[PDB]
Amino acid sequence: VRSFIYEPFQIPSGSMMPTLLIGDFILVEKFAYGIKDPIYQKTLIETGHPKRGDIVVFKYPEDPKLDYIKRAVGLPGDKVTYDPVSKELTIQPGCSSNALPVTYSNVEPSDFVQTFSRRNGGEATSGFFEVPKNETKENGIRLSERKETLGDVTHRILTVPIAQDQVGMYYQQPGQQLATWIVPPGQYFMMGDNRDNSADSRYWGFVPEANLVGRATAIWMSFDLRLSRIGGIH
């Protein structure tokens, strides 16, 4: 006697590359589901919770009028530390006041190249393009790829070899060094797979449970007419 609500979701940005791409249309399963008991035919309202590594759609805390999609990397109580040089995560569960095994595969060239306009000789991102590994684009940088295993979940991330986060721009948590955060009760730390192209928890803080919409379950369609991407999230 249980029911789940599902809603389609268009992928607007490349913050989740290479896992999710601009043009992807995904299925999202709401955390809040109905529980129709037995004796009575009522519909109890129970809410599920994201597991570490889940790809989650949520309402932007600063402006809940917009929905974002990131990977839930930090759970309540998690002590999250990000090394901007190695671009690696360290996660220590239950440190609200034991190190989780987070491993990374070897850096390899990805299928994408990020380009940038050059008005005035400066640089501004101008898009992502799938480019054969033996080719290049002028004013573009080949992005690197590797696998991140957050405990039991393994997924891919992209990195921009010429970039490095400016720690001073991070959301700084009271009483904490820059680049370290303790996830508050009932809140989450969100990060996108395209690690140098993601305005996430590093910059605007945690996501309250109530802002959560649902978990991404599949790519129902994608229009960069990529029938090849329909299926599970990889």
UniProtKB/Swiss-Prot annotation:
GO terms for biological process: protein processing; proteolysis; signal peptide processing. Residues 2-234 are periplasmic. One of its GO terms (cellular component) is plasma membrane. Its EC number is 3.4.21.89. GO terms for molecular function: endopeptidase activity; peptidase activity; serine-type endopeptidase activity. The active site is at residues 15, 70. This is Signal peptidase I.
